[PDB]
């Protein structure tokens, strides 16, 4: 297109005007800011997977492959799941529409919604999407830590730390959601802790 | 870690010092330069999937979901598969090692290697990885265009163009690999054309 | 070896001595008793999918493909999920052994176990596996009924009914678990009732 | 409806009237004749996976899980892929109808058809489907044998043998397609020979 031509022009102008990976970054397909811009990391530091609503699905061959490769082959010692506010995937999950094949992918998010349905049901409707985004990140870290790949790494004494962050488009800050695991025991404790802290609602948003 | 602390410091300093998507960008997990930096695109323009060796696997629920969502729901009219030189996933595919679960993901690349085994067998060993990277991009575009999602979009007269590029880390330029499809007929012609053009070897690299 | 020679001898001897399918049968790979034997149906009546612990995982391309083909192309009007007692898959899921790749598959079952943990915990330890087998079937009918494929089949007025049964290996009697949907409303209602019924315990099953 | 009542009546009547598995059986969801009937094996001998057109897709979590569980946990020493003539899945794959989601599943079969297009093209049109059914089985044994699971089972000295058969619905006789591997070398050799043999055509099959 003229859109494709413009892109080739931008690329040429950009390029003209102008190592080991240490992190696996699992982000969302509709997040606007690259991991590299958020973290100000040196190119090559980041190994990056992006899927809709930044999920670690138990049986997703794509994401699991990336994880096994990062951990077993690349020897990466930090995996970060990063969510973000105003997440179109999360809003897509919460809407009552038949969107087609994507809805099947998003049913995992809806399972998370129902798992925390008491919490999300005590909360004013217009605030739920942000809560769900945050809880999602906690649950995906929990899923990551329960994979065979990560359990096995921990069991053979490999150094591996999982992290679960969210960034707000309003200020650019990475906010730690509380689930940080270096072992299965630290995974269970920090997960429980994080859900408990998340379940403390602001009094002005309670139904 | 001190690596995680440094990252939070970089993020804070960065953030302090500091819309509709029109493209689906399918890139590789080990590529260093973000789509946004390569294309100099406005944030929100890009919807991005990253997997190892930038594949569209026939039955990958992750990637297919992203594609169905982009096309059917977001109404994106351009899907770009971008490969890159010095691709660790491609080198991982070509190596003779048991790397574990990831090897299963990379068997699709090896199927592509064998499909073009005459071409790649006429070429000096040390040049094959770059050829395979380029051929990979052509084949993934072909795979994308053969998905039910894309066929159906074309058949109901939706505007949808597929693109297959590679960027070289040495100069930052996006190089078009020749497969550009707006229909099933343009997909077959440009695919054949592109393989034929790729199969013309430099005389100094021929065995 | 001789095992295989024997196999061919058995078959040669068996063979010497001697159509629209209407049901989709989803059953477990462990299951001893074939669907035809259970139902005394004629050859060709059954279209069969077998996986470990008879799952309809939201994002499993294999099973969803079977379901979409069955519903949209074969026009099958009845889908049956069939569990069984003494299910090795269920037993595998409840053990805390590292079994490797399959553990990731069985994590969906453990999610279900946790989901119904209060109920399952108030059962006798030697009855829990069979209770989970039954709960599993109810949950998989629920999952089947929330697929985009089934939902939109119902939405466009296609006649389609979902069933979830279990047979005891000891006696071979099919027992209906109570989740039976001809639409999304009847899925909700009968799933809610099915779980509610399973939650009324018979004293001899009580811890 | 009455269909289902009848089903339960059939079963009640059938039931009233009236263990280590050693084989993994991968077969087609269409297949009319159960594995036990084909082999006259005892209940519990067979661990069974059924999918459309009996595929071992490189990245299918469902089938790979079955295989890993069978090999690593059940310690099964024989894996059998069994195709059949008049295969609806094969026929679906060869038609150029848009069938929806399942077409993506069947694209792997079309890749195989293209791979052997010269051979298949010199056959009579009414023999091609059955020829592709046989080629499919050989290719799926090949795929099975290139899985990380099988390869590393062989690498660590585990006894494991792969088989690929086809039965004609007309007569029920299992016929070995010639790919039979007890190791990666014997996979290569017997796959090369199996295809070579299938390529020697009998004149009555010639166009
Ligand atoms: Zn998002
Ligand atoms: Zn790469
Ligand atoms: Zn079972
Ligand atoms: Zn078949």
**Is C49 in the active site?**
no
**Selection from B177, B191, B111, B106 nearest residue B145 by Cα:** B191
The sheet that has B23-28: what strands, in order across it? A174-181, A161-167, A78-84, A23-28, A46-51, B46-51, B23-28, B78-84, B161-167, B174-181
Residues 6+ apart with CB under 8 A from C85: C130, C133, C166, C167, C168, C169, C170
Q: Which residues of A touch D62 (CB under 8 A)?
A: 59
Residue A104 has its nearest CB partner, among C107, C115, C148, at: C148
Count Cβ–Cβ pairs < 8 Å, chain A vs chain D.
Answer: 12
Shortest CA gap D25–chain B (Å): 21
Catalytic residue among A49, A84, A116, A163: A84
A174-181 vs B161-167, strand pairing mode: unpaired
Helix or strand run (H / E) with residue A109: helix A101-115
Helix or strand run (H / E) with residue A46: strand A46-51
Shortest CA gap A122–chain B (Å): 31
Ligand nearest to the CA of B82: 2
CB atoms within 10 A of CB D42: 11
Helix or strand run (H / E) with residue A23: strand A23-28
Q: How far is the CA of B149 from the centre of ligand 2 (A)?
A: 25
Helix or strand run (H / E) with residue A161: strand A161-167
Q: Which of residues 49-78 of C touch B (CB under 8 A)?
A: 59-62, 64-65
Q: How far apart (Å, rounded) are the C-alpha atoms in residues A37 and A30? A: 15
Catalytic residue among C32, C58, C192, C197: C32
Residue of chain C whose Cα is closest to the Cα of A109: C58
Does A152 reach chain B within 8 Å, measured CB to CB?
no
Q: How far apart (Å, rounded) are the C-alpha atoms in residues D40 and D46? A: 11
Per-residue DSSP letter, C8? H
Q: Which residues of A touch B4 (CB under 8 A)?
A: 78, 161, 163
User: SS3 sequence, chain B?
Assistant: CHHHHHHHHHHHHHHHHCCCCCEEEEEECCCCCCHHHHHCCCCCCEEEEEECCCCCCCCCHHHHHHHHHHHHHCCCCEEEEEEECCCHHHHHHHCCCCCCHHHHHHHHHHHHHHHCHHHHHCECHHHHHHHHHHHHHHHHHHHHHHCHHHHHHHHCCCCCEEEEEEECCCCCCEEEEEEEECCHHHHHHHHHHHHHHHCCCCHHHEC
Q: How far is the CA of B69 from the centre of ligand 1 (A)?
A: 13
Q: How far apart (Å, rounded) are the C-alpha atoms in residues A88 and B19? A: 11
Q: Which residues of B touch D58 (CB under 8 A)?
A: 104-105, 107-108, 111
Residues 6+ apart with CB under 8 A from D36: C34, D43, D45, D46
Shortest CA gap A142–chain D (Å): 20
Q: How far is the CA of A55 from the centre of ligand 1 (A)?
A: 10
Cβ distance D148 to B59 less than 8 Å, yes or no, reads no
Q: What is the residue-wise DSSP string for D140-185?
A: HHHHHHTSHHHHHHHHTT---EEEEEEE-TTT--EEEEEEEESSHH
Extents of the domains making up chain D: 1-207
Contact, C57 vs A59, CB < 8 A? yes
Residue C60 has its nearest CB partner, among A59, A99, A103, at: A59
Token digits for B43? 């944030």
Backbone angles phi, psi at D163, to 5 degrees: -135, 150
| Method used to solve the structure | X-ray
List chains touching D (3+ CB pairs under 8 A). Answer: A, B, C
Instruction: Give the resolution to one decimal, in Å.
Output: 2.3
> Residues of C comprising the binding site for Zn(2+)?
28, 30, 84, 87
**Is A49 in the active site?**
no
Arch. (CATH architecture) of A1-207: 3-Layer(aba) Sandwich (3.40)
> Residues of C comprising the binding site?
28, 30, 84, 87
Token digits for B39? 């294309």
Does C90 reach chain D within 8 Å, measured CB to CB?
no
Query: What is the CA B117 to chain-centroid distance, rounded?
Result: 20
Q: How far apart (Å, rounded) are the C-alpha atoms in residues A108 and A33? A: 25
Q: Distances from the Cα of B6 to the Cαs of A35, A109, B73, D157, in angstroms?
A: 14, 32, 39, 46
**Is A60 in the active site?**
no
Count Cβ–Cβ pairs < 8 Å, chain A vs chain C.
Answer: 52
Residues 6+ apart with CB under 8 A from D5: none
Q: Which residues of D touch A103 (CB under 8 A)?
A: none
Q: How far apart (Å, rounded) are the C-alpha atoms in residues A26 and A76? A: 13
């Amino acid at each position: 297109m003229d859109k494709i031509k413009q892109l080739f022009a931008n690329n040429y102008s950009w390029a003209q005007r102008m190592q080991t990976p240490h992190y696996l970054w699992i982000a969302c397909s509709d997040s606007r800011v690259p991991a590299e811009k958020l973290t100000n990391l040196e190119p090559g530091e980041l190994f990056v997977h992006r899927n809709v609503a930044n999920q670690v699905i138990h049986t997703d061959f794509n994401c699991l492959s990336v994880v096994q490769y990062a951990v077993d082959v690349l020897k990466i010692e930090h995996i970060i799941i990063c969510g973000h506010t105003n997440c179109g995937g999360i809003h897509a999950a919460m809407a009552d529409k038949d969107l087609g094949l994507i809805n099947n992918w998003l049913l995992h998010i809806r399972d998370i919604w129902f798992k925390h349905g008491h919490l999300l049901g005590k909360l004013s409707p217009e605030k739920r999407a942000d809560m769900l985004t945050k809880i999602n990140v906690a649950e995906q870290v929990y899923n990551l830590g329960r994979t065979s790949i990560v359990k096995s790494a921990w069991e053979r004494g490999q150094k591996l730390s999982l992290h679960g962050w969210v960034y707000d488009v309003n200020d650019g800050f990475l906010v730690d959601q509380g689930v940080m695991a270096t072992s299965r025991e630290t995974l269970e404790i920090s997960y429980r802790n994080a859900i408990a802290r998340l379940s403390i609602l602001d009094e002005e948003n309670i139904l």
